[PDB]
RNA sequence: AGGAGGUAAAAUUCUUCA
RNA sequence: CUUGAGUCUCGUAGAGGGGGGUAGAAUUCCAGGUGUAGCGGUGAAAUGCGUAGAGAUCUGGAGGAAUACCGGUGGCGAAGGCGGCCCCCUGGACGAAGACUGACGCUCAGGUGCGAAAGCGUGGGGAGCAAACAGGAUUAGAUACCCUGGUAGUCCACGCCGUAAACGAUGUCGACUUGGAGGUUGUGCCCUUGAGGCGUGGCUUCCGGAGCUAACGCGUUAAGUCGACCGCCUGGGGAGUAC
RNA sequence: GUUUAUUAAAAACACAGCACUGUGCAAACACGAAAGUGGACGUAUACGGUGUGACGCCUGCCCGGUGCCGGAAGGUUAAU
């Protein structure tokens, strides 16, 4: 579930510094990472429903997180969607 | 890169080739910067039940810290090699020593 | 299961069956398959194992 | 008990027929029971512990 | 014909009939005898006594080979499971070994159902 | 791969194509081709001995080797071709000597395999060797009845044989028909199954879909007249006769097997 | 005393209101 | 802003799910050797099977499916549901502390997805079991219970069906409220000096308080005591039917 | 689509499909006193005969007579 190497790596790219994984940008970032990783996971098998709700839960999670960030600071929202590459 | 028990048994007739197996095996592993903390050869030991005819086989314990890659393509060599009878890789949980 | 008597006797003395196989696990897998029904049976008997 | 290779410790936890002895007799612990059974299952496969006495 | 001394007593007692066959140390069967073959039809042979006389029936047909001793492998529960081996011993046979070979599958085939009585 | 066309037109909606992507597209291997004309159900006397034979699309023969004498000489499957003459697919294999030959491409066959024949050939699909060296039970196709003749048993698509006996210098084979015929182990065979199996999944779709194949319309005995067929002509869908051939031969059960020569090589008839 | 096994084959129907 | 709700570090347990292999026993089929009139079955028989040699017995082979013992009011998941062993991939839950984000929460018509068994479509496979069906018995009648056979099906890939006593017949989440006996999984402390001793969390089982209810009962996991929201009922039959 | 060229072009025939049955190769069958050939230089997912006639829902009851597929104690029974 996302190596600790990638996790700590992402945190030091969105948040002001380390240990700042709590930041909204960090979360939505580490979440999308898996959504893209597991993305290929489901590309195969395709019969894994139990683990499917999990991926959906991850997206539905960041989704609500985006509305919040977009609610507070709009700038931080755009600078996130264009960077992370999503929303279309 | 995790640990694997690995405990196969070679046919009593191909016991002279056994000492060679460990060579290529350990070689293929070390080739990918693998590891190795234990290697035992109990030798021709008694069997519990008549497996694939003939009694008593040649057991060869093992213990390597190879990645989940070179290890997956290891059983393919055992299955292809009619010499060896059984084969089994177990858990990981760090490494061990001696015992048995 | 098996018995290797000594010498001074001919009597069976094979009362080992009445403590393992024989019918303790044979009669079980003899009739219906049950499946989920056993749970209720064991639960019923387990409820009488208290007093 | 804590391993399967230690057949010298798992040979006294099984009946003469090879059937795994319950915790009711051995008086073994809970967590140690499943581990003890899990060890036997592994040994049997590696032809370490006969499944039955018929052999 | 022939002159063996060590054989085997493959008995197969069931909830209907008990078949006893005395073979050699090779498993070729020298002579057999059923509880039903010696009469007793229906519940008549579904008794321990049916197997008793059955053993003597197989005995008085295999002794022609001079069978001194022989093993005994029991198979199938039901009556005539104990009384069977109790006959050969009294028949004059030197009982040596007694092993059970009742087919016990590790849960594979699906048993019947119809039995509502 | 099976495909079901859509109802774009009548006689096309009941069509079920059976194409194969791993099948070569183009001209076959000329060096292994010949004339192979079309008779038409007639013999030297020009008489139509076998009815329902005519028309059909022009076909060519494929030099296929069923004997497989090239022992101790490995070979690589270059590709898979379509053989109209048969219902199975042929494989153009290339041995290490440079010689090419056609063989009934087994089920698990691919382009780039290493097959070989001989009393030393590994037990695998695509290899040929005497049943005397092939383990019992091994599913084998293209079996022979005589050592040196050639494979004649299980040559169609989806068909296969299974060795299940030995005894002496012979072996009993379980023919796909369900019959167990005895054949001397001295006869070679090819492990694995035959070609495709989707051949029976076909349904043509229309009448003309059976004309260009070599089959002609079928006439009923009840439709014909008594002077032509024993079933008489009738006067409005009549019969009253016994299901027989247009020559006076009972059918629907009436067995017509007379050999006594190979009856010994038989264990249990089909069922 | 605890446990296990064994131990029954089929045999219908009886008006309405009090 | 941090106590709600999440993220992060380490570690632990599991028939959770998906995919690919593998092992043993037994049954059935088949082959060889030996052997011979019985076998098989039922309450009693019979149909059936057998002199083309069964059953029984010994050896070998193939195939399908299910995993004895372990195994237990034991474990896991939202529910349905889920049991040999091993590898690969993967979800969620939980615990010992600290740090961080800072209500980012709960529920939720429509809608969407999943969803036992049975059934259906395109194929494969098919040991056993087994609707329909066939042939014997029982009976006043037997289109059933019983016996001998046996197709679909059960199995597998893909695409549909979305139905159940799909229940704990109790929707989900949060807070508060006397206890006792067990199961199961972490963790702190102590001559580890007893296989333990002294505490603290998650989950689960039985019983039992107040209270609640028509009663049965439930009873810290509530049908108790409250709050938020959705669905649903308004006599039974009609009918889970008609348009 | 085919058919009574030259009074009938139709509900007839053919038809893909489905079913039963025969066939283990020197096949069954067919043309032939025979050889030989066709069937097929194919091998049960093949081929021949018969029946029905896309598809959808389904295809019941009955084995005496007449046939076919087996077994079989006894009885009758040709040539010699």
Swiss-Prot record, chain A:
- Quote a single Gene Ontology cellular component term: cytosolic small ribosomal subunit
Q: List the disulfide bonds.
A: none
Kindly list any coiled-coil regions of this protein: none
Record function comment: One of the primary rRNA binding proteins, it binds directly to 16S rRNA where it helps nucleate assembly of the platform of the 30S subunit by binding and bridging several RNA helices of the 16S rRNA. Binds to its own mRNA, stabilizing it 5-UTR and preventing its translation. In the E.coli 70S ribosome it has been modeled to contact the 23S rRNA of the 50S subunit forming part of bridge B4. In the two 3.5 A resolved ribosome structures there are minor differences between side-chain conformations.
Q: What do we know about how this protein assembles, alone or with others?
A: Part of the 30S ribosomal subunit. Forms a bridge to the 50S subunit in the 70S ribosome, contacting the 23S rRNA.
Keywords for this protein: Ribonucleoprotein, Ribosomal protein, RNA-binding, rRNA-binding, Translation regulation
**Alphabetized InterPro entries for the sequence:** Ribosomal_uS15, Ribosomal_uS15_bac-type, uS15_NS1_RNA-bd_sf
An MF annotation (GO) of this entry:
structural constituent of ribosome
How is this protein named in the record?
A: Small ribosomal subunit protein uS15
Q: Which GO terms describe its biological process?
A: cytoplasmic translation; regulation of translation; ribosomal small subunit assembly; translation
* Similarity-based family: Belongs to the universal ribosomal protein uS15 family.
HAMAP family found in the cross-reference section: Ribosomal_uS15_B (MF_01343_B)
One Pfam family linked to the record: Ribosomal_S15
Induction info? Part of the metY operon that extends to pnp, also has its own promoter.
Curated annotation (Swiss-Prot), chain C:
Keywords attached to this entry: Ribonucleoprotein, Ribosomal protein, RNA-binding, rRNA-binding
Comp. bias regions, Basic residues: 43-51
Top-rank taxon of the source lineage equals Bacteria
A GO BP entry is: cytoplasmic translation
Record-level Gene Ontology MF annotations: rRNA binding; structural constituent of ribosome
Task: Please provide, in alphabetical order, the Gene Ontology terms of the cellular component aspect for this entry.
Answer: cytoplasm; cytosol; cytosolic small ribosomal subunit
UniProt similarity note = Belongs to the bacterial ribosomal protein bS21 family.
**Functional description taken from the UniProt entry:** Probbly involved in recognition of ribosome rescue factor SmrB in stalled/collided disomes; fusion of protein fragments to its N-terminus decreases ribosome rescue in the presence of SmrB.
**Self-association or partners: how does it assemble?**
Part of the 30S ribosomal subunit. In stalled ribosomes contacts ribosome rescue factor SmrB.
What's this protein's name? Small ribosomal subunit protein bS21
Q: Which gene encodes it?
A: rpsU
Residues shown, of full length:
4 to 54 of 71
Swiss-Prot record, chain D:
Q: Does the keyword Ribonucleoprotein apply?
A: yes
Q: List S-S links within the chain.
A: none
Keyword DNA damage carried by entry: no
Tell me which GO cellular component terms the UniProt record holds: cytoplasm; cytosol; cytosolic small ribosomal subunit
Q: Which GO terms describe its biological process?
A: cytoplasmic translation; translation
> Per UniProt, which keywords does this protein have?
Acetylation, Ribonucleoprotein, Ribosomal protein, RNA-binding, rRNA-binding
Molecular-function GO terms, alphabetical = mRNA 5'-UTR binding; small ribosomal subunit rRNA binding; structural constituent of ribosome
The domain of life is Bacteria
Report the protein's function: Binds as a heterodimer with protein bS6 to the central domain of the 16S rRNA, where it helps stabilize the platform of the 30S subunit.
To which protein family does this belong? Belongs to the bacterial ribosomal protein bS18 family.
Assembly description:
Part of the 30S ribosomal subunit. Forms a tight heterodimer with protein bS6.
Q: What is this protein called?
A: Small ribosomal subunit protein bS18
User: Where does this protein come from, organism-wise?
Assistant: Escherichia coli (strain K12)
The lineage, from the top, is: Bacteria, Pseudomonadati, Pseudomonadota, Gammaproteobacteria, Enterobacterales
Q: Which residues of the full protein are shown?
A: 20 to 74 of 75
UniProtKB/Swiss-Prot annotation, chain F:
GO MF, one term, reads: transferase activity
Which superkingdom heads the taxonomic lineage of this protein's source? Bacteria
Keywords recorded for this protein, A-Z: Acetylation, Ribonucleoprotein, Ribosomal protein, RNA-binding, rRNA-binding
Keyword Acetylation (UniProt): yes
N6-acetyllysine, modified sites? 241
Q: Show the InterPro entries listed in the entry.
A: NA-bd_OB-fold, Rib_uL2_dom2, Ribosomal_uL2, Ribosomal_uL2_bac/org-type, Ribosomal_uL2_C, Ribosomal_uL2_CS, Ribosomal_uL2_dom3, Ribosomal_uL2_RNA-bd_dom
**Chain spans, region Disordered:** 27-52, 220-271
Q: Name one GO cellular component term.
A: cytoplasm
The UniProt regions of compositional bias labelled Low complexity, in chain numbering, are 38-47
Coiled coil location: none
- What are its GO biological-process terms? cytoplasmic translation; negative regulation of DNA-templated DNA replication initiation; ribosomal large subunit assembly
Q: Which SUPFAM superfamilies match?
A: Nucleic acid-binding proteins, Translation proteins SH3-like domain
Similarity comment: Belongs to the universal ribosomal protein uL2 family.
Listed under subunit, the entry gives: Part of the 50S ribosomal subunit. Forms a bridge to the 30S subunit in the 70S ribosome, contacting the 16S rRNA. Interacts weakly with S6 in one of the 3.5 A resolved structures. In pull-down experiments interacts with CedA.
Other notes:
This protein can be partially replaced in vivo by its H.marismortui (HmaL2) or human (L8, from the 60S cytoplasmic ribosome) homolog.
The record ties this protein, via PANTHER family, to: LARGE RIBOSOMAL SUBUNIT PROTEIN UL2M, RIBOSOMAL PROTEIN L2
Q: Would you tell me the protein name for this molecule? A: Large ribosomal subunit protein uL2
Q: Which organism is it from?
A: Escherichia coli (strain K12)
The taxonomic lineage of its organism, from the top, reads: Bacteria, Pseudomonadati, Pseudomonadota, Gammaproteobacteria, Enterobacterales
């Amino acid at each position: 579930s996302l190596s600790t190497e990638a996790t700590a790596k992402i945190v030091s790219e969105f948040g002001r510094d380390a240990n700042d994984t709590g930041s909204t940008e960090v979360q939505v970032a580490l979440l999308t990472a898996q959504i893209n990783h597991l993305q290929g996971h489901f590309a195969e098998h395709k019969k894994d429903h139990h683990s499917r709700r999990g991926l959906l839960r991850m997206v539905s999670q960041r989704r609500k997180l985006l509305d919040y960030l977009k609610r507070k600071d709009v700038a931080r929202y755009t600078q996130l969607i264009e960077r992370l590459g999503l929303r279309r | 890169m995790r640990h694997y028990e690995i405990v196969f048994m070679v046919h009593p007739d191909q016991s002279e080739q056994v000492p060679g197996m460990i060579e290529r095996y350990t070689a293929a592993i070390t080739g990918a910067e693998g590891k190795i903390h234990r290697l035992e050869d109990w030798g021709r030991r008694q069997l519990a039940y008549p497996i694939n005819k003939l009694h008593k086989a040649h057991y060869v314990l093992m213990n390597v810290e190879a990645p989940q890659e070179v290890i997956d393509e290891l059983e393919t060599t055992f299955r292809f090699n009619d010499a060896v009878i059984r084969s089994m890789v177990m858990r990981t949980k760090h490494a061990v020593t001696e015992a048995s | 299961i098996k018995v290797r008597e000594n010498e001074p006797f001919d009597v069976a003395l094979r009362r080992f069956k009445r403590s393992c196989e024989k019918a303790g696990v044979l009669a079980e897998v003899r009739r219906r398959e049950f499946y989920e029904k056993p749970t209720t049976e064991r639960k019923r008997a387990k409820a009488s194992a208290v007093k | 008990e804590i391993d399967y290779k230690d057949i010298a410790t798992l040979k006294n936890y099984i009946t003469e027929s090879g059937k795994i002895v319950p915790s009711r007799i051995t008086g073994t612990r809970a967590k140690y029971q499943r581990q003890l059974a899990r060890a036997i299952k592994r040994a049997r496969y590696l032809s370490l512990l006969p499944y039955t006495d018929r052999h | 014909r022939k002159q063996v001394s060590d054989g085997v007593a493959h008995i197969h007692a069931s909830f209907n009939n008990t078949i006893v066959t005395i073979t050699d140390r090779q498993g070729n069967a020298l002579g057999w005898a059923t509880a039903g073959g010696s009469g007793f039809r229906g519940s008549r042979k579904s008794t321990p006594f049916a197997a008793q006389v059955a053993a003597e029936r197989c005995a008085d047909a295999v002794k022609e080979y001079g069978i001194k001793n022989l093993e005994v492998m029991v198979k199938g529960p039901g009556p005539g499971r104990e009384s069977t081996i109790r006959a050969l011993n009294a028949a004059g046979f030197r009982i040596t070994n007694i092993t059970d070979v009742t087919p016990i599958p590790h849960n594979g085939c699906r048993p019947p159902k119809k039995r509502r009585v | 791969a099976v495909v079901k066309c859509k109802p774009t037109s009548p006689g096309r909606r009941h069509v079920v194509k059976v194409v194969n992507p791993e099948l070569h597209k183009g001209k076959p291997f000329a060096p292994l081709l010949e004339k192979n004309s079309k008779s038409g159900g007639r013999n030297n006397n020009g008489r139509i001995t076998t009815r329902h034979i005519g028309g059909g699309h022009k076909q060519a023969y494929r030099i296929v080797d069923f004997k497989r004498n090239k022992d101790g000489i490995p070979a690589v499957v270059e590709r898979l071709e379509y053989d109209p003459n048969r219902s199975a697919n042929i494989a153009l294999v290339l041995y290490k000597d440079g010689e090419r030959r056609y063989i009934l491409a087994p089920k698990g066959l691919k382009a780039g395999d290493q097959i070989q024949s001989g009393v030393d050939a590994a037990i695998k699909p695509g290899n040929t060797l005497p049943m005397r060296n092939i383990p019992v039970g091994s599913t084998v196709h293209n079996v022979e009845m005589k050592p040196g003749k050639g494979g004649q048993l299980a040559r169609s698509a989806g068909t296969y044989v299974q060795i299940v006996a030995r005894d002496g210098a012979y072996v009993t084979l379980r023919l796909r028909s369900g019959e167990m015929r005895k054949v001397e182990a001295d006869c070679r065979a090819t492990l694995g199954e035959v070609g495709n199996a989707e051949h029976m999944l076909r349904v043509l779709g229309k009448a003309g879909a059976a004309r260009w194949r070599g089959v002609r319309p079928t006439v009923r005995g009840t439709a014909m007249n008594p002077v032509d067929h024993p079933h008489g002509g009738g006067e409005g869908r009549n019969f009253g006769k016994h299901p027989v051939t247009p020559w006076g031969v009972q059918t629907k059960g009436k067995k017509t097997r007379s050999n006594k020569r190979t009856d010994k090589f038989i264990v249990r008839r089909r069922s």
